[PDB]
Structure 1
Amino acid sequence: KFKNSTYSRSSVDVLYTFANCSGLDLIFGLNALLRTADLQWNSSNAQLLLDYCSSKGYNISWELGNEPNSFLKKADIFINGSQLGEDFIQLHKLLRKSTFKNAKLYGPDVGQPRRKTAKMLKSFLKAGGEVIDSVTWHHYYLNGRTATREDFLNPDVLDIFISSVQKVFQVVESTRPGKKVWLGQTSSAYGGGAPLLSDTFAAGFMWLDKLGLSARMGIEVVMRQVFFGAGNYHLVDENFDPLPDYWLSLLFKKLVGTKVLMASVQGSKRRKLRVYLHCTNTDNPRYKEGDLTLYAINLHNVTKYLRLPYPFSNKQVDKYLLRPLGPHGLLSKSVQLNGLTLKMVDDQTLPPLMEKPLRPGSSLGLPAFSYSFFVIRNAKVAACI
């Protein structure tokens, strides 16, 4: 199914300028299937690209290969993890000889840790782990061809992610202890996404839960597949319109800080009411050092009312509750924040993200099949100062 294609300097420029103008840091995956007669990586084409990018002053980070666990199926070539590690060492030497001698290198972008994938990741980290700056792996919950609505709302499906994360850390701690672990490509469902689901409000339960679990478990960076493109799991559709997961992602960015904390629900039902706690993002002008950001997912079919523990019970709380714009309910491509439809002011202007201040001491209402952020003002948490 997959054929070789070429790309131009123009294409490289289009990509870099997009990233640069947008304040994003570009990571470029190099082709690992360029092989010598003895199945060593042939670095000649990469050398051409590195030189070009250095010639243009492009500050770029690098990867080599995507899902090398699948190379036999995709290209009838098997590359073992030991060889891949050597290939990475060879790329690292090229970077060290380039104009950006300190450029970062990530890999190996393996799929989620089945027996054979875990084996490949282990042998890769043993061989090449010294030259990678973070370990990258990928995750999807479901096949987009067969995924159901029901699956997108099922805690038993959401929970499978926990075991994948545990298995990756088990490999990493046995080979390269303390190395940073990144989700290098992830979404709800593979095969380009689940039609009519992966681009809707319903997609947000998986996305927000994955973010919460990733942060809580030690994953440092989560790369959402995709910002824009052909698959259903895009954040922005082919008309350049943002979908509900874009607005969810923007709110997360604005409200959720780097320091991860913990929340849990008493009585120990851990299933349908899912809660996460970080310090509030210190770049948000509205809030101050010490504030907390709670986020919560309600997969029950009734509203739940959450009570904050001492010493936060009477604090002013700002609610940021997301619900779909009708008539398509959870299958809507439009979302409202605290009852206001989210939409661009114009092509140059995101809207303000308006809070709903709650009555101090009130329980936090979370409707059925919904998710919300809650900022606890003047929380004065020392860990967050």
Structure 2
Amino acid sequence: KFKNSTYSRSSVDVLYTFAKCSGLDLIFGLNALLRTSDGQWNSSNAQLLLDYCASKGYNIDWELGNEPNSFRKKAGIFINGSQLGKDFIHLHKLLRKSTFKNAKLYGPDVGQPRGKTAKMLKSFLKAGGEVIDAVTWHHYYLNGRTATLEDFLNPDVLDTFISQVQKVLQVVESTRPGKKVWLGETSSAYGGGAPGLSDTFAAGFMWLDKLGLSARMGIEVVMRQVFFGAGNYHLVDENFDPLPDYWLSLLFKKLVGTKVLMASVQGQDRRKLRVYLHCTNTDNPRYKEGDLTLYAINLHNVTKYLRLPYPFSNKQVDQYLLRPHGPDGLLSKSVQLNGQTLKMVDDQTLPPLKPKPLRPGSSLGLPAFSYAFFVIRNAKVPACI
């Protein structure tokens, strides 16, 4: 029942080394519920940790507290946004006094907009917005305890994310316009994810759509809960087996670049056919400046065929179509790329992610309940060059 635990220098070392050896940038959340009798953040424990990390040469970025909107319910104490902002200013001073060069600070990691949470975010940004390098908030679509496959396939559920993003951006725009906005913790369903759902092929519709809408609406970074752990929304389970959302994320990383463009369906939009368009990831050796990556979701129960607009209509297109593998259907934990099951070659070797080149001028076929990436080669888009 008591959630309080200690952690060691070795735990810190292990977490930092895991990030470094994997090419990841570590962000460490500090404990905001250490309080003085005067209602201030007591920084003494964080100071010990900062001093240790600085002594070791660790380049780490920091956060302070997790979902402070729920402190009253989870910890019996209410900290208002103004005070939380003061606490971040105190932490910022400690980071500047340290031997960390350019340590970044993110916050306040509030839960998604509901009347009172929006007010806490606003008051936080008024008082503490100056010292954070990006505003972090959290989002889940559904309660993991009650979510059904139908919910995971429902365009109305997917669309609820739009209003949540709009509310957060409006708050930030009114206090710190052009401050960067990040999803600091996000997945399909809260409460550890939906059992037998959040770890399946069908989880991919929520994940890919969220990436698409976040990019199109001005979110700069999206942090998936979780890469690894016991929750049903993990990308990798504790047997170290990747779930379908891992392969989806890997293909996204390899194919989708940083410049966000726009794609839409001509005419009647039922919102079951959902399309997003970016420049192609230039880091990908197969492709060159000017290429475009289209990604698309088909939530209809029949195949749809996408016709590219001129001049892309007659370009060579590489297809990366994901389908579930095996008798579990949409609930499978196994996924195929262009008909080939995705599996590690060995413990240290990711498999090849081979495109299927399509006949130029052919319409792009998207089967019922599937999603896909399509790279438009030699698109020669000046915005991408």
Give the shorter-chain TM-score range.
over 0.9
Deviations 1:108-129 (A, max 9, x none): 0000010010000000000000
For residues 349-374 of structure 1, give each alpha carbon's deviation from its aligned partner in whole angstroms, at most 9, with x where no partner exists: 00010100000000000000000000
Matches of 1:274 and 1:268, distance apart in 2: 12
State the Cα deviation string for residues 193-233 of structure 1 (Å, max 9, x = none).
Answer: 00000000000000000000000000000000000001000
Once the two structures are overlaid, the 10-residue window that deviates more, 266-275 or 62-71, is: 266-275
Distance 1:36 1:127 in 2: 19
Query: Counterparts of 1:90 and 1:250 in 2: how far apart (Å)?
Result: 38
Measured against aligned partners, the alpha-carbon deviations of 1:229-262 in whole angstroms (never above 9, x if no partner) come to 0100000011100000000000000000000000
Partner of 1:383, secondary structure, is: coil
What is the number of residues matched between the two proteins? Answer: 385
Deviation at 1:101, TM superposition (A): 4.1
TM-score (norm 1): 0.99
TM-score, normalised with respect to structure 2: 0.99
Match status 1:247 vs 2:247: yes
Tell me what 1:264 maps to. Answer: 264
What is the distance in 2 between the residues matched to 1:197 and 1:56? 41
Alignment partners' CA distance in 2, 1:53 and 1:100? 9
Distance 1:4 1:297 in 2: 42
SS at match of 2:213: helix
C-alpha distance in 2 between matches for 1:192 and 1:173: 32
Q: CA deviation at 1:67?
A: 0.2
Cα distance in 1, alignment partners of residues 346 and 319 from structure 2: 25
Within-5 A mapping of 1:1-385: 1-385=1-385
Where does structure 2 lack aligned partners over 5 or more consecutive residues? none
The Cα of 1:336 is off from its aligned counterpart by 0.2
Q: Distance in 2 between matches of 1:372 and 1:233?
A: 21
Q: Deviations over 1:146-186 (max 9, x none)?
A: 00110000000000000000000000000011100000000
> Are 1:2 and 1:74, in contact at CA under 8 Å, matched by a contact in 2?
no
Can you list the C-alpha shifts for 1:296-353, whole angstroms capped at 9, x where unaligned? 0000000000000011000000000000001111000000000000000000000010
Q: SS state of the match for residue 140, structure 1?
A: strand
4+ long deviations beyond 6 Å: none
Note the C-alpha offset of 1:270. 4.5
Deviation of 1:3 after TM superposition, in Å, equals: 2.2
Q: Tell me the secondary structure at the aligned position of residue 382 of structure 1.
A: coil
Rounded to whole Å, the distance in 1 between the matches of 2:171 and 2:58 is 34
Distance 2:274 2:74 in 1: 38
Instruction: Provide the C-alpha distance between the structure 2 equivalents of 1:7 and 1:298, rounded to a whole number of angstroms.
Output: 45
Whole-angstrom distance in 2 between the partners of 1:161 and 1:110: 15
- Residue aligned with 1:174, SS: helix
Distance in 2 of aligned mates of 1:6 and 1:107: 23
Contact 1:135 1:179 in 2 (8 A): yes
**Displacement, 1:267?**
1.0
Contact 1:216–1:261 (CA under 8 A) maintained in structure 2: yes
Checking the alignment, whether the CA contact within 8 Å between 1:315 and 1:360 is kept in structure 2 is yes
**For 1:166, what is the secondary structure of its paired residue?**
helix
* In 2: Cα distance, 1:4 partner to 1:151 partner: 35
The alpha carbon displacement at 1:268 in A equals: 3.2
Kindly indicate whether the alpha-carbon contact (under 8 Å) linking 1:89 and 1:128 is maintained by their aligned counterparts in 2.
Answer: yes
Contact kept in structure 2, 1:254 and 1:284, CA below 8 Å:
yes
- Cα distance between partner residues in 2 of 1:268 and 1:107: 40
Q: 1:2 Cα deviation (Å)? A: 4.3
- Give the deviation of 1:102 after TM superposition: 1.8
Partners of 1:245 and 1:286 in 2: CA distance: 23
For 1:3 and 1:225, locate their aligned partners in 2 and report how far apart those are by CA, in whole Å. 20
* Gap change, CA 1:126 and 1:335, over 3 Å in 2: same
